[PDB]
Structure formats: C-alpha cells, structure tokens
PDB file of all heavy atoms in Angstrom:
ATOM      1  N   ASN A 269      31.679 152.309  48.466  1.00 10.21           N
ATOM      2  CA  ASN A 269      32.819 153.000  47.849  1.00 10.21           C
ATOM      3  C   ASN A 269      32.725 154.515  47.836  1.00 10.21           C
ATOM      4  O   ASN A 269      33.642 155.176  47.368  1.00 10.21           O
ATOM      5  CB  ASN A 269      33.016 152.553  46.434  1.00 10.21           C
ATOM      6  CG  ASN A 269      33.711 151.246  46.316  1.00 10.21           C
ATOM      7  OD1 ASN A 269      34.916 151.117  46.618  1.00 10.21           O
ATOM      8  ND2 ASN A 269      33.050 150.262  45.848  1.00 10.21           N
ATOM      9  N   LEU A 270      31.619 155.051  48.319  1.00  8.79           N
ATOM     10  CA  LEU A 270      31.403 156.490  48.356  1.00  8.79           C
ATOM     11  C   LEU A 270      31.376 157.027  49.764  1.00  8.79           C
ATOM     12  O   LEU A 270      30.970 156.267  50.680  1.00  8.79           O
ATOM     13  CB  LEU A 270      30.101 156.795  47.641  1.00  8.79           C
ATOM     14  CG  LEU A 270      30.087 156.556  46.109  1.00  8.79           C
ATOM     15  CD1 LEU A 270      28.680 156.715  45.574  1.00  8.79           C
ATOM     16  CD2 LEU A 270      31.029 157.529  45.375  1.00  8.79           C
ATOM     17  N   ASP A 271      31.734 158.270  49.956  1.00  9.14           N
ATOM     18  CA  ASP A 271      31.644 158.892  51.282  1.00  9.14           C
ATOM     19  C   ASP A 271      30.211 159.339  51.549  1.00  9.14           C
ATOM     20  O   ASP A 271      29.422 159.456  50.598  1.00  9.14           O
ATOM     21  CB  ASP A 271      32.684 160.003  51.424  1.00  9.14           C
ATOM     22  CG  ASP A 271      32.665 161.137  50.424  1.00  9.14           C
ATOM     23  OD1 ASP A 271      31.592 161.354  49.836  1.00  9.14           O
ATOM     24  OD2 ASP A 271      33.588 161.972  50.458  1.00  9.14           O
ATOM     25  N   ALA A 272      29.890 159.527  52.828  1.00 10.58           N
ATOM     26  CA  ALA A 272      28.549 159.975  53.213  1.00 10.58           C
ATOM     27  C   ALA A 272      28.132 161.319  52.613  1.00 10.58           C
ATOM     28  O   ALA A 272      26.960 161.522  52.299  1.00 10.58           O
ATOM     29  CB  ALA A 272      28.444 159.994  54.716  1.00 10.58           C
ATOM     30  N   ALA A 273      29.118 162.213  52.399  1.00 10.80           N
ATOM     31  CA  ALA A 273      28.807 163.517  51.796  1.00 10.80           C
ATOM     32  C   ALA A 273      28.295 163.349  50.353  1.00 10.80           C
ATOM     33  O   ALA A 273      27.348 164.018  49.953  1.00 10.80           O
ATOM     34  CB  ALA A 273      30.078 164.388  51.825  1.00 10.80           C
ATOM     35  N   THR A 274      28.925 162.412  49.589  1.00 13.30           N
ATOM     36  CA  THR A 274      28.493 162.138  48.227  1.00 13.30           C
ATOM     37  C   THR A 274      27.136 161.409  48.270  1.00 13.30           C
ATOM     38  O   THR A 274      26.236 161.796  47.529  1.00 13.30           O
ATOM     39  CB  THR A 274      29.546 161.328  47.441  1.00 13.30           C
ATOM     40  OG1 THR A 274      30.769 162.103  47.450  1.00 13.30           O
ATOM     41  CG2 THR A 274      29.177 161.066  46.022  1.00 13.30           C
ATOM     42  N   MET A 275      26.985 160.391  49.148  1.00 14.09           N
ATOM     43  CA  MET A 275      25.687 159.673  49.255  1.00 14.09           C
ATOM     44  C   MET A 275      24.558 160.590  49.715  1.00 14.09           C
ATOM     45  O   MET A 275      23.407 160.327  49.373  1.00 14.09           O
ATOM     46  CB  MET A 275      25.803 158.463  50.177  1.00 14.09           C
ATOM     47  CG  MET A 275      26.599 157.276  49.550  1.00 14.09           C
ATOM     48  SD  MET A 275      25.904 156.669  47.974  1.00 14.09           S
ATOM     49  CE  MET A 275      24.285 156.014  48.528  1.00 14.09           C
ATOM     50  N   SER A 276      24.846 161.690  50.437  1.00 16.40           N
ATOM     51  CA  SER A 276      23.762 162.590  50.916  1.00 16.40           C
ATOM     52  C   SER A 276      23.149 163.351  49.748  1.00 16.40           C
ATOM     53  O   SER A 276      22.078 163.926  49.871  1.00 16.40           O
ATOM     54  CB  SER A 276      24.283 163.548  51.977  1.00 16.40           C
ATOM     55  OG  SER A 276      25.185 164.454  51.412  1.00 16.40           O
ATOM     56  N   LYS A 277      23.852 163.370  48.597  1.00 15.36           N
ATOM     57  CA  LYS A 277      23.377 164.031  47.362  1.00 15.36           C
ATOM     58  C   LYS A 277      22.421 163.136  46.598  1.00 15.36           C
ATOM     59  O   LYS A 277      21.871 163.541  45.578  1.00 15.36           O
ATOM     60  CB  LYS A 277      24.581 164.400  46.450  1.00 15.36           C
ATOM     61  CG  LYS A 277      25.461 165.480  47.057  1.00 15.36           C
ATOM     62  CD  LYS A 277      26.609 165.712  46.057  1.00 15.36           C
ATOM     63  CE  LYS A 277      27.632 166.727  46.491  1.00 15.36           C
ATOM     64  NZ  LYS A 277      28.620 167.001  45.428  1.00 15.36           N
ATOM     65  N   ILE A 278      22.259 161.874  47.022  1.00 15.02           N
ATOM     66  CA  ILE A 278      21.318 160.907  46.381  1.00 15.02           C
ATOM     67  C   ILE A 278      19.954 161.086  47.036  1.00 15.02           C
ATOM     68  O   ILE A 278      19.842 161.020  48.272  1.00 15.02           O
ATOM     69  CB  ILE A 278      21.849 159.445  46.540  1.00 15.02           C
ATOM     70  CG1 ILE A 278      23.262 159.209  45.923  1.00 15.02           C
ATOM     71  CG2 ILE A 278      20.835 158.396  46.035  1.00 15.02           C
ATOM     72  CD1 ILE A 278      23.513 159.627  44.564  1.00 15.02           C
ATOM     73  N   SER A 279      18.892 161.293  46.231  1.00 16.63           N
ATOM     74  CA  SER A 279      17.587 161.536  46.784  1.00 16.63           C
ATOM     75  C   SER A 279      16.936 160.253  47.296  1.00 16.63           C
ATOM     76  O   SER A 279      16.182 160.303  48.296  1.00 16.63           O
ATOM     77  CB  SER A 279      16.678 162.189  45.760  1.00 16.63           C
ATOM     78  OG  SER A 279      17.140 163.462  45.373  1.00 16.63           O
ATOM     79  N   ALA A 280      17.140 159.126  46.608  1.00 17.97           N
ATOM     80  CA  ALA A 280      16.481 157.855  46.964  1.00 17.97           C
ATOM     81  C   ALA A 280      17.216 156.698  46.379  1.00 17.97           C
ATOM     82  O   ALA A 280      17.878 156.813  45.357  1.00 17.97           O
ATOM     83  CB  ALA A 280      15.066 157.832  46.415  1.00 17.97           C
ATOM     84  N   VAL A 281      17.024 155.529  47.013  1.00 19.46           N
ATOM     85  CA  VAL A 281      17.588 154.288  46.517  1.00 19.46           C
ATOM     86  C   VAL A 281      16.435 153.295  46.519  1.00 19.46           C
ATOM     87  O   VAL A 281      15.786 153.112  47.552  1.00 19.46           O
ATOM     88  CB  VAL A 281      18.810 153.783  47.334  1.00 19.46           C
ATOM     89  CG1 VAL A 281      19.236 152.409  46.912  1.00 19.46           C
ATOM     90  CG2 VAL A 281      19.962 154.768  47.254  1.00 19.46           C
ATOM     91  N   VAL A 282      16.258 152.553  45.405  1.00 21.64           N
ATOM     92  CA  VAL A 282      15.176 151.529  45.300  1.00 21.64           C
ATOM     93  C   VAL A 282      15.846 150.239  44.869  1.00 21.64           C
ATOM     94  O   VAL A 282      16.474 150.191  43.816  1.00 21.64           O
ATOM     95  CB  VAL A 282      14.021 151.886  44.323  1.00 21.64           C
ATOM     96  CG1 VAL A 282      13.003 150.772  44.291  1.00 21.64           C
ATOM     97  CG2 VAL A 282      13.366 153.217  44.742  1.00 21.64           C
ATOM     98  N   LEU A 283      15.785 149.209  45.716  1.00 20.98           N
ATOM     99  CA  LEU A 283      16.414 147.921  45.392  1.00 20.98           C
ATOM    100  C   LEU A 283      15.361 146.854  45.273  1.00 20.98           C
ATOM    101  O   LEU A 283      14.547 146.662  46.174  1.00 20.98           O
ATOM    102  CB  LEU A 283      17.427 147.493  46.470  1.00 20.98           C
ATOM    103  CG  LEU A 283      18.522 148.568  46.830  1.00 20.98           C
ATOM    104  CD1 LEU A 283      19.429 148.065  47.893  1.00 20.98           C
ATOM    105  CD2 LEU A 283      19.287 148.953  45.568  1.00 20.98           C
ATOM    106  N   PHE A 284      15.303 146.208  44.106  1.00 24.25           N
ATOM    107  CA  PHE A 284      14.359 145.123  43.859  1.00 24.25           C
ATOM    108  C   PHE A 284      15.138 143.811  43.968  1.00 24.25           C
ATOM    109  O   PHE A 284      16.232 143.719  43.397  1.00 24.25           O
ATOM    110  CB  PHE A 284      13.742 145.208  42.472  1.00 24.25           C
ATOM    111  CG  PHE A 284      12.944 146.463  42.223  1.00 24.25           C
ATOM    112  CD1 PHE A 284      13.570 147.554  41.617  1.00 24.25           C
ATOM    113  CD2 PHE A 284      11.630 146.560  42.581  1.00 24.25           C
ATOM    114  CE1 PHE A 284      12.830 148.709  41.336  1.00 24.25           C
ATOM    115  CE2 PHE A 284      10.875 147.734  42.294  1.00 24.25           C
ATOM    116  CZ  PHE A 284      11.500 148.781  41.680  1.00 24.25           C
ATOM    117  N   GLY A 285      14.562 142.857  44.685  1.00 26.65           N
ATOM    118  CA  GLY A 285      15.167 141.534  44.872  1.00 26.65           C
ATOM    119  C   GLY A 285      16.609 141.588  45.276  1.00 26.65           C
ATOM    120  O   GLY A 285      17.474 141.049  44.583  1.00 26.65           O
ATOM    121  N   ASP A 286      16.853 142.330  46.357  1.00 24.81           N
ATOM    122  CA  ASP A 286      18.188 142.608  46.885  1.00 24.81           C
ATOM    123  C   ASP A 286      18.844 141.368  47.450  1.00 24.81           C
ATOM    124  O   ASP A 286      18.442 140.880  48.478  1.00 24.81           O
ATOM    125  CB  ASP A 286      18.089 143.714  47.978  1.00 24.81           C
ATOM    126  CG  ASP A 286      19.415 144.194  48.543  1.00 24.81           C
ATOM    127  OD1 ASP A 286      20.452 143.859  47.972  1.00 24.81           O
ATOM    128  OD2 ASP A 286      19.395 144.937  49.564  1.00 24.81           O
ATOM    129  N   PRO A 287      19.977 140.923  46.833  1.00 21.56           N
ATOM    130  CA  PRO A 287      20.706 139.756  47.403  1.00 21.56           C
ATOM    131  C   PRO A 287      21.265 140.032  48.790  1.00 21.56           C
ATOM    132  O   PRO A 287      21.517 139.056  49.507  1.00 21.56           O
ATOM    133  CB  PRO A 287      21.824 139.537  46.369  1.00 21.56           C
ATOM    134  CG  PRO A 287      21.312 140.159  45.103  1.00 21.56           C
ATOM    135  CD  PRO A 287      20.636 141.384  45.600  1.00 21.56           C
ATOM    136  N   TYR A 288      21.476 141.316  49.152  1.00 19.58           N
ATOM    137  CA  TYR A 288      21.993 141.728  50.458  1.00 19.58           C
ATOM    138  C   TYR A 288      20.857 142.172  51.393  1.00 19.58           C
ATOM    139  O   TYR A 288      21.110 142.909  52.345  1.00 19.58           O
ATOM    140  CB  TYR A 288      23.089 142.805  50.292  1.00 19.58           C
ATOM    141  CG  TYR A 288      24.343 142.383  49.523  1.00 19.58           C
ATOM    142  CD1 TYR A 288      25.132 143.321  48.875  1.00 19.58           C
ATOM    143  CD2 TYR A 288      24.760 141.062  49.561  1.00 19.58           C
ATOM    144  CE1 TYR A 288      26.283 142.923  48.191  1.00 19.58           C
ATOM    145  CE2 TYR A 288      25.920 140.658  48.860  1.00 19.58           C
ATOM    146  CZ  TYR A 288      26.688 141.605  48.231  1.00 19.58           C
ATOM    147  OH  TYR A 288      27.842 141.217  47.562  1.00 19.58           O
ATOM    148  N   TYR A 289      19.629 141.692  51.129  1.00 21.00           N
ATOM    149  CA  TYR A 289      18.457 142.041  51.952  1.00 21.00           C
ATOM    150  C   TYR A 289      18.819 141.837  53.429  1.00 21.00           C
ATOM    151  O   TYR A 289      19.381 140.799  53.790  1.00 21.00           O
ATOM    152  CB  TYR A 289      17.243 141.191  51.552  1.00 21.00           C
ATOM    153  CG  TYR A 289      15.973 141.488  52.287  1.00 21.00           C
ATOM    154  CD1 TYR A 289      15.455 142.808  52.328  1.00 21.00           C
ATOM    155  CD2 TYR A 289      15.254 140.507  52.949  1.00 21.00           C
ATOM    156  CE1 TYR A 289      14.284 143.101  52.960  1.00 21.00           C
ATOM    157  CE2 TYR A 289      14.071 140.796  53.643  1.00 21.00           C
ATOM    158  CZ  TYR A 289      13.569 142.120  53.623  1.00 21.00           C
ATOM    159  OH  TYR A 289      12.428 142.427  54.289  1.00 21.00           O
ATOM    160  N   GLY A 290      18.510 142.839  54.235  1.00 18.28           N
ATOM    161  CA  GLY A 290      18.828 142.852  55.657  1.00 18.28           C
ATOM    162  C   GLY A 290      19.948 143.802  55.982  1.00 18.28           C
ATOM    163  O   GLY A 290      20.056 144.304  57.109  1.00 18.28           O
ATOM    164  N   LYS A 291      20.815 144.105  55.021  1.00 17.41           N
ATOM    165  CA  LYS A 291      21.956 144.997  55.194  1.00 17.41           C
ATOM    166  C   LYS A 291      21.548 146.375  54.652  1.00 17.41           C
ATOM    167  O   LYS A 291      21.047 146.446  53.562  1.00 17.41           O
ATOM    168  CB  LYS A 291      23.221 144.445  54.506  1.00 17.41           C
ATOM    169  CG  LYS A 291      24.251 145.382  53.995  1.00 17.41           C
ATOM    170  CD  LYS A 291      25.273 144.701  53.076  1.00 17.41           C
ATOM    171  CE  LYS A 291      26.197 145.653  52.354  1.00 17.41           C
ATOM    172  NZ  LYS A 291      27.019 144.939  51.337  1.00 17.41           N
ATOM    173  N   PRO A 292      21.767 147.471  55.413  1.00 19.56           N
ATOM    174  CA  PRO A 292      21.376 148.803  54.895  1.00 19.56           C
ATOM    175  C   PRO A 292      22.343 149.304  53.807  1.00 19.56           C
ATOM    176  O   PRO A 292      23.464 148.793  53.683  1.00 19.56           O
ATOM    177  CB  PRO A 292      21.419 149.724  56.122  1.00 19.56           C
ATOM    178  CG  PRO A 292      22.068 148.959  57.196  1.00 19.56           C
ATOM    179  CD  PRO A 292      22.370 147.582  56.760  1.00 19.56           C
ATOM    180  N   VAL A 293      21.902 150.234  52.988  1.00 15.07           N
ATOM    181  CA  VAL A 293      22.767 150.815  51.926  1.00 15.07           C
ATOM    182  C   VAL A 293      23.808 151.633  52.751  1.00 15.07           C
ATOM    183  O   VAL A 293      23.445 152.413  53.601  1.00 15.07           O
ATOM    184  CB  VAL A 293      21.963 151.750  51.008  1.00 15.07           C
ATOM    185  CG1 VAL A 293      22.840 152.563  50.078  1.00 15.07           C
ATOM    186  CG2 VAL A 293      20.932 150.940  50.186  1.00 15.07           C
ATOM    187  N   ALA A 294      25.091 151.340  52.484  1.00 16.14           N
ATOM    188  CA  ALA A 294      26.183 151.967  53.239  1.00 16.14           C
ATOM    189  C   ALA A 294      26.216 153.476  53.104  1.00 16.14           C
ATOM    190  O   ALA A 294      25.818 154.020  52.043  1.00 16.14           O
ATOM    191  CB  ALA A 294      27.513 151.371  52.859  1.00 16.14           C
ATOM    192  N   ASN A 295      26.633 154.194  54.183  1.00 11.80           N
ATOM    193  CA  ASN A 295      26.879 155.651  54.195  1.00 11.80           C
ATOM    194  C   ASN A 295      25.669 156.469  53.713  1.00 11.80           C
ATOM    195  O   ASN A 295      25.883 157.491  53.063  1.00 11.80           O
ATOM    196  CB  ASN A 295      28.147 155.964  53.295  1.00 11.80           C
ATOM    197  CG  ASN A 295      29.301 155.086  53.625  1.00 11.80           C
ATOM    198  OD1 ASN A 295      29.575 154.805  54.794  1.00 11.80           O
ATOM    199  ND2 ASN A 295      29.898 154.489  52.638  1.00 11.80           N
ATOM    200  N   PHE A 296      24.475 156.012  53.997  1.00  9.77           N
ATOM    201  CA  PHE A 296      23.263 156.637  53.498  1.00  9.77           C
ATOM    202  C   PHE A 296      22.128 156.534  54.479  1.00  9.77           C
ATOM    203  O   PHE A 296      22.078 155.604  55.292  1.00  9.77           O
ATOM    204  CB  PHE A 296      22.901 155.892  52.198  1.00  9.77           C
ATOM    205  CG  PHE A 296      21.780 156.513  51.414  1.00  9.77           C
ATOM    206  CD1 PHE A 296      21.897 157.725  50.807  1.00  9.77           C
ATOM    207  CD2 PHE A 296      20.567 155.786  51.227  1.00  9.77           C
ATOM    208  CE1 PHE A 296      20.846 158.270  50.054  1.00  9.77           C
ATOM    209  CE2 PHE A 296      19.563 156.316  50.423  1.00  9.77           C
ATOM    210  CZ  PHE A 296      19.683 157.560  49.842  1.00  9.77           C
ATOM    211  N   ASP A 297      21.179 157.478  54.401  1.00 10.32           N
ATOM    212  CA  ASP A 297      20.047 157.509  55.311  1.00 10.32           C
ATOM    213  C   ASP A 297      19.033 156.440  54.814  1.00 10.32           C
ATOM    214  O   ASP A 297      18.494 156.570  53.744  1.00 10.32           O
ATOM    215  CB  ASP A 297      19.419 158.927  55.349  1.00 10.32           C
ATOM    216  CG  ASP A 297      18.182 159.101  56.204  1.00 10.32           C
ATOM    217  OD1 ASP A 297      17.726 158.073  56.813  1.00 10.32           O
ATOM    218  OD2 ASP A 297      17.620 160.197  56.182  1.00 10.32           O
ATOM    219  N   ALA A 298      18.848 155.390  55.659  1.00 12.17           N
ATOM    220  CA  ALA A 298      17.935 154.261  55.391  1.00 12.17           C
ATOM    221  C   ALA A 298      16.458 154.683  55.121  1.00 12.17           C
ATOM    222  O   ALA A 298      15.743 153.944  54.475  1.00 12.17           O
ATOM    223  CB  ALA A 298      17.967 153.249  56.539  1.00 12.17           C
ATOM    224  N   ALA A 299      16.066 155.889  55.624  1.00 12.69           N
ATOM    225  CA  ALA A 299      14.716 156.413  55.398  1.00 12.69           C
ATOM    226  C   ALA A 299      14.494 156.742  53.929  1.00 12.69           C
ATOM    227  O   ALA A 299      13.356 156.807  53.456  1.00 12.69           O
ATOM    228  CB  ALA A 299      14.469 157.688  56.238  1.00 12.69           C
ATOM    229  N   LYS A 300      15.584 156.895  53.158  1.00 13.33           N
ATOM    230  CA  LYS A 300      15.593 157.192  51.758  1.00 13.33           C
ATOM    231  C   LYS A 300      15.772 155.983  50.888  1.00 13.33           C
ATOM    232  O   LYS A 300      15.911 156.101  49.659  1.00 13.33           O
ATOM    233  CB  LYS A 300      16.649 158.289  51.430  1.00 13.33           C
ATOM    234  CG  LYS A 300      16.400 159.623  52.124  1.00 13.33           C
ATOM    235  CD  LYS A 300      17.369 160.673  51.670  1.00 13.33           C
ATOM    236  CE  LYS A 300      17.149 161.928  52.497  1.00 13.33           C
ATOM    237  NZ  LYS A 300      18.160 162.968  52.176  1.00 13.33           N
ATOM    238  N   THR A 301      15.725 154.796  51.492  1.00 16.94           N
ATOM    239  CA  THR A 301      15.892 153.500  50.780  1.00 16.94           C
ATOM    240  C   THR A 301      14.617 152.694  50.864  1.00 16.94           C
ATOM    241  O   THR A 301      13.980 152.596  51.925  1.00 16.94           O
ATOM    242  CB  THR A 301      17.042 152.692  51.376  1.00 16.94           C
ATOM    243  OG1 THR A 301      18.241 153.477  51.410  1.00 16.94           O
ATOM    244  CG2 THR A 301      17.314 151.417  50.608  1.00 16.94           C
ATOM    245  N   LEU A 302      14.235 152.079  49.706  1.00 19.94           N
ATOM    246  CA  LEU A 302      13.138 151.121  49.629  1.00 19.94           C
ATOM    247  C   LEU A 302      13.709 149.882  49.101  1.00 19.94           C
ATOM    248  O   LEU A 302      14.249 149.832  47.968  1.00 19.94           O
ATOM    249  CB  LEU A 302      11.997 151.613  48.713  1.00 19.94           C
ATOM    250  CG  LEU A 302      10.847 150.635  48.563  1.00 19.94           C
ATOM    251  CD1 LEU A 302      10.075 150.479  49.861  1.00 19.94           C
ATOM    252  CD2 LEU A 302       9.882 151.067  47.476  1.00 19.94           C
ATOM    253  N   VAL A 303      13.616 148.797  49.860  1.00 16.58           N
ATOM    254  CA  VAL A 303      14.100 147.488  49.416  1.00 16.58           C
ATOM    255  C   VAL A 303      12.842 146.638  49.239  1.00 16.58           C
ATOM    256  O   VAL A 303      12.048 146.480  50.178  1.00 16.58           O
ATOM    257  CB  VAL A 303      15.101 146.848  50.415  1.00 16.58           C
ATOM    258  CG1 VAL A 303      15.536 145.476  49.902  1.00 16.58           C
ATOM    259  CG2 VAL A 303      16.300 147.757  50.607  1.00 16.58           C
ATOM    260  N   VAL A 304      12.634 146.171  48.012  1.00 17.05           N
ATOM    261  CA  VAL A 304      11.474 145.372  47.663  1.00 17.05           C
ATOM    262  C   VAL A 304      11.925 143.933  47.524  1.00 17.05           C
ATOM    263  O   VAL A 304      12.675 143.604  46.632  1.00 17.05           O
ATOM    264  CB  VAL A 304      10.739 145.871  46.383  1.00 17.05           C
ATOM    265  CG1 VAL A 304       9.482 145.065  46.127  1.00 17.05           C
ATOM    266  CG2 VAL A 304      10.439 147.359  46.469  1.00 17.05           C
ATOM    267  N   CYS A 305      11.548 143.104  48.520  1.00 19.21           N
ATOM    268  CA  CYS A 305      11.933 141.699  48.558  1.00 19.21           C
ATOM    269  C   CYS A 305      10.730 140.856  48.832  1.00 19.21           C
ATOM    270  O   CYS A 305      10.094 140.997  49.867  1.00 19.21           O
ATOM    271  CB  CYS A 305      13.045 141.481  49.619  1.00 19.21           C
ATOM    272  SG  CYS A 305      14.716 141.420  48.883  1.00 19.21           S
ATOM    273  N   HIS A 306      10.376 140.007  47.857  1.00 21.01           N
ATOM    274  CA  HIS A 306       9.189 139.162  47.938  1.00 21.01           C
ATOM    275  C   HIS A 306       9.427 137.997  48.813  1.00 21.01           C
ATOM    276  O   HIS A 306      10.501 137.454  48.900  1.00 21.01           O
ATOM    277  CB  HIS A 306       8.822 138.671  46.519  1.00 21.01           C
ATOM    278  CG  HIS A 306       8.263 139.712  45.637  1.00 21.01           C
ATOM    279  ND1 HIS A 306       8.147 139.553  44.294  1.00 21.01           N
ATOM    280  CD2 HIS A 306       7.756 140.978  45.965  1.00 21.01           C
ATOM    281  CE1 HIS A 306       7.609 140.641  43.817  1.00 21.01           C
ATOM    282  NE2 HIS A 306       7.346 141.535  44.804  1.00 21.01           N
TER     283      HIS A 306
END
C-alpha cells in the first residue's frame, strides 16, 4: 500500500513466522529485510 519512496525511508523490516514466506516485502530493498521462518 505504500510507494517505494515512502518504503525507502524504512531502515529495516524483520518478519517472524511469515505466512507469506517466499514473497519479498513489496516496494522495498530485500537486503534490508530479515524473514525468520523455522
């Protein structure tokens, strides 16, 4: 729901037990995302 310019202002994303595991966080640099899925 956000544009890439707004998402570029986010420093990091951490997702625990992500139901959408395998799909990247939209409009955002995946290098700044950590998905923790056991």
Side-chain angles (χ1 to χ4, degrees):
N269 280 292
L270 292 171
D271 56 23
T274 302
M275 288 301 295
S276 69
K277 292 178 182 186
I278 303 307
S279 296
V281 173
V282 180
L283 307 179
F284 300 94
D286 184 13
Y288 297 155
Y289 184 56
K291 153 193 170 186
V293 169
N295 311 320
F296 187 65
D297 177 0
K300 298 185 184 174
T301 306
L302 178 67
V303 180
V304 185
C305 262
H306 290 165

